[PDB]
Amino acid sequence: NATRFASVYAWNRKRISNCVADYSVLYNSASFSTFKCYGVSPTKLNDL
């Protein structure tokens, strides 16, 4: 929910650390049209 997004050639990188990630908020949201996880299943992220 950043107001402005960076251009693809200048993609922004944000580091996430020392926090609890409630991935449900993401995979239970209806605001996303594409949600594709490679090498992991999003449900199990809550346990990882």
Binding site: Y27, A30, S33, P42, T43
Partner: protein, 49 residues
């Protein structure tokens, strides 16, 4: 020749059509209609606007 055919009919929204498939997640699959992982049979869907 089949044992016994079953037709399950309902209505959803387009974005959730993907959820009608084995091994899918989301509102419809979790809370409304869930196919088995080894599901055998056909799924047919068409717009009804």
């Amino acid at each position: 020749c089949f044992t016994n055919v079953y037709a399950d009919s309902f209505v959803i929204r387009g974005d959730e059509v993907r959820q009608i498939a084995p091994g899918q997640t989301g509102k419809i699959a979790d809370y409304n209609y869930k196919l088995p992982d080894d599901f055998t049979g056909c799924v047919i869907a068409w717009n009804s606007n």
